[PDB]
């Protein structure tokens, strides 16, 4: 909304754009999440499991 | 630079030193090749993009990329328009400026009508479609600009309006200024005091668009590796340090005029003076060419003719040798192409046959575009003697364009460097296109270099424009084939191969058709794309995916390790020779990088861990040192 | 489809089950009576001889296809190029004179007519800003010509890159928002007939030739438009079933169907994007989307 | 005027006996490169049409016929010596071109085509 | 076929790097497009690409804003003052040293 | 089928002028055939003038060191040609009457 | 000296201009000075016929020499390669492959049937 | 990885005493899948395979 | 990977009949009949004018493409389940085709017969302005193999100018995995939270 | 680097054998074949040992950074 300074790069996004994108605050933290007691490795195969 | 093997040693150096690239606060850096377009040399292309610009924009227009002898760049544009106006585009300071031709082409020399009449209509007086063309394009001057008789008097009103973005002083009159808009951008590559040979070229190019727009000419291909060339490295570099001493030389400027914009002290022969000005006046070149080669920024106050302003410069990798030989050997179209909707530029073409490798291309996003070059494939870095051979078409059956006036796509237009010199039949063509190639293999001729490329295109109905193009400048790509009489090495680019007939093998040359051999099939590969053993043997997505899996082994960067700091490198331990190897393993001496290791390898499907990627190590030759690396 | 539910479908297409009497032979007839025709599609040549003096005169001259070429391959008789040359074309080739001189400030010949080719050429001449002469090949239909004559205060057009640009506009016949159609292959027995365009209000008077009952487009915001809401849920399931089918990807009626049932629950048909997401309860529903 | 020195004016010329005849006198045009001389030859043997060859200090030639805007020149009387030799623009009569050839040889198709 | 690996040639070298021309002579033609590229800045012909660079890009000049109080006439507003023709003739690469 | 050659005049007789098409030139005015002089090599300067007609001529840089073209005189009753070194002159034409030029700058 | 409808000057080659659009009987070159006011010169006649692109149609495409449209059906592709039909009774089926994967997995054959058409993909 | 685009992961390290010996008594290094080839197609591993052992005998 | 002597011999007589194949369609397209040489100065004009206009160079292309893989399909139906050395119950790359294991009997075809027409964006092979499709070849020369027809085969190699083409086609299937990473990722998404 | 004191495959010392192999080489001037056979090397997968070893030590004794010069 604000013009201002109006040489690029606008500095403090505001508590809109803290909400607003694909990351945002509503799909990056509420919609999807960060977890405990996970792990990720390398799979490898095994015909004896 | 001139240094043996035993005193690269001595000196810390890898024995083999390959050279090629510079060092930017200890990053190992080097300058990407670019493909552009060919130099001095007009392509009548169909643009959708044309029609952006507004009304009446047509489709179609000419476009040169004119050099200068100091290998920069000035793109000149020749559209047409519907309501038969034809206009001429160029670019000033990164701005983008459209003008009359017949204020172009009455400001170089003393034009009549009929000069400017006969220059486009030689003969085809009685075709109708392109005498009606003319009269827009003389009675549309005559009547938009009335005031206009003479040379002297054109270049009054084109240095009038040009004058502010050229940035002259007030002491330069108006046809000092508007001479120089015809010195500094109109096709720059026939020099100052080059204004006959402009006039000529121009009226080349408006009847090549006119014979556009009759459909008689097939719109040349910008992306197809005839119409385009190499810049290189080193002269991108020089680019940009031209640009870097002229902002430096206005700098002066402006910080001389803050002092008058004050009025502090100003004796402009004192010697006291002048040293004042230049304490304050950042004179430190070296530190912004460094900022380029760091970043690969393209920082530009006037801006050059390339596309993009970014990633001109990558990092050279030492993960092993064969990843650090194949970064100078690498070409790239464009970063302006990866970013497009349209995947017809990645097409693989048969323009690049022994120019550029079928298979050494990265898969993934910069496939197609980040296509390398093949094996026997060099550039010229400096031009030959081009003085000689206009002596010699004359002594041949060329007619001398000072006193012909014969244009048309009837005639066979001869060329030097986008230099037109002269105008022959079709049938007399052929001739001294072939005659001259057979005085340049055989080196009795005192003035036809081997690196003169000789490129005749015979006239069709509907296809490419014809002529005798021929070309001797830098940034070219070549290739050599064997001349079948006399069995001699013949120097080929890519505008002649696609009208000469090269044969593969000695064992396929047919009667009275092929006229060249390739020295052998190989030629046509990579370095890297030609260490693949029996390739003819593998599916073709194989042979690409070794050229990606090559480069990132790890095996031996170097032997002078212990002299380097870099980031982080690979080191297998214990390399091995192969036992299959191809005879081009030898000559690039890689021997000294062992790459791999030999291995018994049985071919069974005997544990169960092990499907479709999946291998089965033995536990006891690991143990015994099996492909152990640091 | 599933995404923007656009009532501007790329391709719409209408798929026409023919009858029985109905032949192949009266079916291609009956596709030539529909496919739009261009008065660019019947010319040979145009020869345009300018001359100037007396008032700049411009002579435009066509050369047609053979009488028993044009209509086979289009179904337009003689009768119907002149309906047109006269009443339309000429209208449209004077509106685009008249609108350069406003951009302008800023073989054979053929005579001795009898009393019907006069009186015609009389009706044009009071009818046309800039014409005074006029003929029609009334014999064979090979050629027609008019003779324009404008001001001498005029400069040089390009008279033929006009004519070029009008004979592209000028439809001969065409009903209308139908470009074309074309009688493909019968498979499974279904004997149809595809029309590049979606007119239904046209096509159902063609009831002597097309079975009406059975129409079906692609287009669901026409299908929607002309037969219910019921008929675009089915327009629906049978447009994404084609997407699947065609790279032998089965899935199955049940996520079909509901996917038709989602869209169609307002008895409309609505995009899965934000706008089709207006009409829901939820609001974090909508937050959390864009 | 005033074109700087090295420029000097020519106040003699030679002759041209041409008279704009009414038989008449075949005026031409030919064309030849700097290797050959036309004072140390004599003859020009050329056929009626364009299929000739004529071989001068083992250069071999050929002497095209272009017949089918250059303009003549002749000299005035003696005082400026130049007026254009015209009978009322004119046009020459036969114009034809020595053009330099060289053999080039055929392929040698047992010996460069190896089985 | 017969394409041998070079075993005695190969450990002969390893231990003496040659005192003359390199072996492997293909392996500099491979950056032939960098090396002579970066060499045609300053040789060849007029005197290398930065020296017939030079001088294209010629003059930059300005004037004054103060008078010299000449002869009140039309050339007392015909005169700008005193001019700088500033210009670069010649620039050149030196090879790198070390200063202390 | 073959001829021969008489006279090879190396003093200027002819010259020819490469003019533009459908030039006429009225036959009232003469023209200047001069030559360019260090102290070797030849090349022609032409110029002429009447009220309104000024026009000069000159050769060519490249194609006179090299390509020599020839004017000869025949008469098949003869069988006989002359020859002379005749110059190609390329050639313009100005106008006195239009000879203007502005001033050298915005004036304002 | 009139080329078409463009008639240039006589002794400067200046394009003169157009005589009819001239005011009351009065013309000149601009260069020089011809005057030629009572404008001698005759009817311009330029005829210009279209060039055969400008009218693209499917009649003018049956009077090439090219075939330049197939038939309905009279082009089947090589309907006689060897599989196993799934549905009903078929041994040859027509086959088509596409690359998918970026190089490190090969590629995957489509089949349409001969004798009843049926859609179909293996795996291997 | 070979040279014809035959990568694959490491999957187990495997034992001399149960991986399968000839009768020349040389347990292989590298024992890799059948089913890799059919899909590939790199048949220049099995002329490099019967080569590189024709060369080391 | 081996056919028999006999079986090797089969597909030697089958490729033979190809040789006229090239001439035969482009002697269909042109509406010349009856078999005029190649090199006839009147079949060289009509060619000409096919390359001009990308309608009717890809009848060109579907025609000759056509008969072609006639010919493929001939030399697979005749060798590759009888004319081997080595047969299905000890022939590993039959048995793991036949089965499904691995690959399919298209794979095993190229291995053993021949690759065949290396197709193109749905056609041919691409062709220069000079009427050549590479430096190698005649302009307009009529031949399957000219326009990217493979007689050779993986298990005994594929000469340099059918490399060349091959390499083509291998480029096609991977700028397609360039422009295909994610498709589909919009449009699941948002079908995923309406039917949520 | 050095030559690798085990074969990989059989498990032979076959350290102790390059350079006497090198000496078979020059000296004898046999060739490969018969001086790997004269070493009592007779698999293939011990053969490729001694055969195809780069012995890229010899490059590395090059860089000697506690020497001067």
């Known amino acids: 909304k604000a013009q201002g300074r109006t040489s690029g790069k606008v500095p403090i996004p505001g508590v809109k754009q803290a909400l607003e994108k694909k990351e945002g605050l509503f799909r990056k933290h509420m919609m999807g999440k960060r977890v405990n007691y996970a792990a990720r490795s390398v799979i490898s195969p095994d015909p004896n499991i | 630079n001139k240094m043996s093997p035993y005193e690269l040693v001595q000196h810390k150096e890898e024995s083999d030193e390959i050279g090629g690239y510079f060092i930017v606060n200890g990053i190992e850096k080097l300058i990407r090749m670019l493909i552009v377009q060919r130099r001095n040399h007009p392509m009548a292309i169909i643009r959708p993009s044309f029609a952006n610009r507004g009304a009446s924009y047509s489709h179609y227009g000419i476009q040169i990329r004119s050099v200068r002898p100091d290998q920069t760049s000035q793109t000149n544009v020749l559209h047409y328009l519907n309501d038969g106006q034809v206009t001429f585009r160029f670019s000033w300071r990164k701005n983008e400026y459209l003008v009359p031709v017949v204020m172009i082409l009455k400001a170089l020399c003393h034009t009549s009508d009929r000069e400017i009449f006969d220059g486009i209509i030689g003969n085809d007086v009685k075709d109708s479609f392109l005498t009606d063309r003319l009269e827009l394009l003389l009675r549309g001057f005559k009547k938009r600009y009335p005031h206009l008789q003479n040379r002297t008097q054109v270049l009054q009103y084109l240095g009038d309006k040009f004058r502010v973005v050229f940035q002259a002083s007030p002491d330069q009159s108006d046809l000092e200024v508007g001479q120089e808009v015809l010195d500094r951008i109109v096709l720059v590559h026939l020099g100052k005091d080059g204004s006959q040979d402009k006039f000529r070229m121009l009226l080349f190019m408006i009847r090549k668009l006119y014979s556009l727009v009759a459909g008689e000419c097939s719109p040349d291909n910008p992306d197809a590796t005839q119409h385009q060339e190499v810049l290189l490295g080193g002269f991108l570099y020089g680019m940009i340090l031209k640009e870097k001493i002229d902002e430096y030389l206005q700098n002066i400027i402006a910080q001389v005029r803050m002092d008058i914009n004050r009025g502090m002290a100003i004796n402009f022969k004192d010697k006291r003076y002048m040293s004042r000005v230049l304490m304050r006046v950042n004179e430190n070149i070296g530190s912004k060419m460094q900022y380029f080669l760091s970043t690969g920024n393209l920082v530009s106050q006037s801006g050059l003719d390339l596309q993009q302003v970014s990633g001109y410069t990558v990092v050279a990798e030492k993960i092993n040798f064969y990843r650090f030989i194949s970064h100078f050997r690498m070409v790239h179209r464009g970063s302006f192409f990866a970013q497009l909707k349209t995947t017809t530029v990645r097409k693989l073409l048969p323009e690049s046959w022994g120019f550029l490798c079928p298979v050494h291309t990265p898969d993934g996003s910069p496939c197609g575009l980040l296509n390398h070059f093949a094996h026997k494939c060099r550039i010229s870095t400096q031009q030959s003697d081009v003085s000689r051979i206009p002596s010699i078409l004359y002594s041949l059956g060329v007619a001398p364009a000072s006193h012909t006036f014969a244009a048309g796509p009837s005639l066979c237009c001869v060329q030097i460097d986008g230099k037109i010199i002269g105008w022959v039949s079709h049938e007399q063509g052929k001739i001294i296109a072939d005659t001259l190639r057979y005085w340049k293999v055989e080196g009795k001729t005192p003035g036809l270099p081997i690196d003169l490329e000789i490129g005749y295109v015979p006239p069709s109905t509907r296809g490419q424009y014809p002529g005798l193009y021929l070309f001797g400048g830098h940034s070219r790509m070549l290739r050599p084939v064997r001349y079948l009489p006399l069995d001699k090495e013949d120097i080929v680019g890519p505008f002649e191969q696609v009208y000469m007939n090269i044969a593969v093998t000695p064992q396929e040359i047919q009667n009275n058709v092929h006229t060249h051999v390739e020295f052998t099939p190989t030629n046509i590969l990579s370095i890297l794309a030609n260490l693949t053993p029996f390739s003819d043997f593998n599916q073709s997505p194989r042979n690409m995916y070794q050229c990606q899996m090559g480069k990132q082994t790890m095996g031996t960067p170097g032997v002078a390790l212990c002299h380097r700091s870099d980031n982080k490198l690979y080191r297998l331990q214990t390399g091995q020779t192969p036992i299959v190897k191809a005879n081009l393993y030898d000559d690039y001496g890689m021997d000294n990088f062992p790459n791999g290791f030999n291995a018994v390898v049985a071919v069974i499907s005997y544990t169960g861990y092990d499907m479709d990627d999946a291998m089965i190590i033995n536990k006891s030759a690991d143990e015994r040192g099996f492909g152990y690396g640091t | 489809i599933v995404m923007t539910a656009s009532a501007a479908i790329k391709t719409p297409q209408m798929t026409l089950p023919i009858w029985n009497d109905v032949s192949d032979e009266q079916a291609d007839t009956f596709c030539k009576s529909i496919s739009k025709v261009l008065l660019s599609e019947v010319i040979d040549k145009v020869i345009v001889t300018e001359t100037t003096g007396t008032a700049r005169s411009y002579v435009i001259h066509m050369r047609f296809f053979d009488n028993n070429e044009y209509s086979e391959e289009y179904d337009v008789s003689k009768e119907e190029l002149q309906n047109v040359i006269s009443n339309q074309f000429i209208h449209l080739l004077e509106a685009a004179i008249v609108k350069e001189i406003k951009k302008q400030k800023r073989v054979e010949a053929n005579n001795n007519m009898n009393k019907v080719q006069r009186d015609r050429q009389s009706a044009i001449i009071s009818h046309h800003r800039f014409i005074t002469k006029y003929n029609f090949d009334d014999e064979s239909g090979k050629w027609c010509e008019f003779k324009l004559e404008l001001a001498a205060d005029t400069e040089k057009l390009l008279m033929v890159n006009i004519v070029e640009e009008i004979c592209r506009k000028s439809i001969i016949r065409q009903i209308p928002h139908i470009d074309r159609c074309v009688h493909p292959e019968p498979e499974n027995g279904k004997r149809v007939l595809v029309t590049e365009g979606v007119n239904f209000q046209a096509m159902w008077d063609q009831e002597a030739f097309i079975d009406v009952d059975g129409i079906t487009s692609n287009d669901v915001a026409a299908v929607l438009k002309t037969y219910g809401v019921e008929a675009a849920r089915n327009t629906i399931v049978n447009e994404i079933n084609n997407v699947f089918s065609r790279y032998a990807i089965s899935v199955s009626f049940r996520h079909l169907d509901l996917i038709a049932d989602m869209m169609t629950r307002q008895g409309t048909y609505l995009a899965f994007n934000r706008q089709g997401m207006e009409t829901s309860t939820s609001s974090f529903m909508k937050m959390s989307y864009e | 005027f005033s074109i700087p020195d090295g420029f000097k004016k020519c106040k003699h010329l030679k002759n041209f006996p041409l008279n704009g005849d009414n038989k008449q006198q075949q005026v031409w045009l030919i064309k030849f490169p700097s290797n050959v001389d036309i004072s140390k030859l004599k003859s020009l043997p050329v056929d009626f049409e364009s299929s000739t060859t004529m071989t001068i200090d083992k250069h071999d030639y050929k002497i095209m016929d272009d017949t089918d805007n250059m303009t003549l020149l002749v000299p005035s009387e003696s005082k400026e010596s130049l007026k254009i030799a015209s009978t009322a623009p004119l046009q020459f009569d036969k114009v034809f071109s020595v053009s330099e050839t060289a053999k080039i040889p055929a392929i040698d198709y047992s010996k460069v085509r190896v089985p | 076929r017969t394409a041998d690996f070079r075993t005695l040639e190969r450990e002969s070298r390893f231990i003496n790097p040659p005192k003359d021309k390199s072996a492997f002579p293909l392996l500099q033609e491979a950056v032939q497009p960098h090396i002579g590229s970066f060499n045609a800045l300053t040789e060849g012909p007029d005197g290398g690409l930065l020296n017939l660079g030079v001088k294209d890009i010629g003059e930059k000049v300005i004037f004054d804003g103060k008078p010299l109080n000449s002869e009140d006439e039309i050339s007392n507003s015909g005169y700008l003052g005193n001019k700088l023709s500033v210009s670069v003739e010649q620039v050149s690469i030196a090879k790198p040293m070390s200063n202390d | 089928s073959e001829i021969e050659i008489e006279s090879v005049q190396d003093q200027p007789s002819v010259a020819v002028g490469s003019f533009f098409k459908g030039f006429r030139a009225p036959s009232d005015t003469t023209f200047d055939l001069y030559k360019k002089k260090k102290s070797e090599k030849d090349e022609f300067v032409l110029h002429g003038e009447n009220e309104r007609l000024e026009y000069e001529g000159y050769t060519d840089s490249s194609s006179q060191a090299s390509n020599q073209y020839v004017v000869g005189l025949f008469n098949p009753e003869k069988k006989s040609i002359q020859l002379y070194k005749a110059p190609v002159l390329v050639s313009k034409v100005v106008s006195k009457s239009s000879k203007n030029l502005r001033g050298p700058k915005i004036k304002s | 000296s009139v080329v078409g409808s463009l008639i240039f000057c006589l002794d400067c080659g200046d394009l003169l201009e157009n005589p009819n659009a001239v005011l009351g009987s009065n013309v000149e070159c601009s260069q020089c000075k011809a005057i030629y006011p009572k404008s001698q010169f005759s009817n311009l006649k330029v005829v210009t016929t279209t060039a055969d692109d400008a009218f693209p149609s499917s009649l003018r495409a049956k009077k090439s020499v090219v075939k330049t449209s197939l038939k309905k059906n009279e082009l089947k592709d090589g309907a006689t390669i060897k599989e196993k039909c799934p549905q009903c009774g078929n041994e040859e089926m027509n086959y088509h492959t596409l690359q998918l994967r970026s190089a490190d997995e090969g590629a995957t054959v489509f089949y349409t049937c001969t004798s009843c058409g049926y859609k179909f993909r293996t795996n291997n | ?57 | 990977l081996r056919l028999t002597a006999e079986g090797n011999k089969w597909r030697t007589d089958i490729l033979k009949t190809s040789v006229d194949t090239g001439r035969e369609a482009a002697a269909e397209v042109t509406n010349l009949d009856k078999d005029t040489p190649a090199d006839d100065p009147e079949l060289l004009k009509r060619l000409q004018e096919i390359l001009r206009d990308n309608n009717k160079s890809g009848i060109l292309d579907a025609v000759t493409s056509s008969k072609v893989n006639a010919i493929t399909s001939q030399v697979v139906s005749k060798c590759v389940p009888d004319g081997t050395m080595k047969k299905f119950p000890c022939n590993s790359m039959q048995a793991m085709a036949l089965s499904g294991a691995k690959g399919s009997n298209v794979n095993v075809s190229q291995i053993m017969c021949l690759l065949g027409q290396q197709a193109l964006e749905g056609r041919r092979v691409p062709v220069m302005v000079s009427g050549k499709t590479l430096p190698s070849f005649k302009p307009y020369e009529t031949d399957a193999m000219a326009g990217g027809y493979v007689k050779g085969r993986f298990y005994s190699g594929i000469k340099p100018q059918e490399y060349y083409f091959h390499c083509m086609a291998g480029r096609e299937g991977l700028i397609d995995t360039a422009v295909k990473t994610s498709r589909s990722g919009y449009l699941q998404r948002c079908l995923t939270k309406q039917l949520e | 680097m050095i030559v690798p004191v085990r074969c990989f495959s059989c498990g032979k010392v076959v350290g102790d054998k390059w350079e006497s192999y090198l000496n078979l080489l020059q000296e004898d001037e046999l060739d490969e074949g018969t001086a790997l056979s004269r070493l009592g090397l007779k698999r293939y997968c011990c053969r490729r040992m001694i055969l195809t070893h780069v012995d890229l030590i010899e490059k590395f004794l090059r860089y000697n950074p506690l020497e001067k010069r």
């Open chain 8, 1 to 57: 990885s070979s040279r014809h685009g035959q990568k694959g992961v490491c999957s187990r390290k495997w034992p001399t005493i149960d991986m399968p010996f000839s009768e020349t008594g040389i347990q292989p290094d590298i024992i890799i899948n059948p089913h890799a080839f059919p899909s590939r197609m790199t048949i220049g591993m099995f002329v490099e395979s019967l080569a590189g052992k024709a060369g080391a005998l």
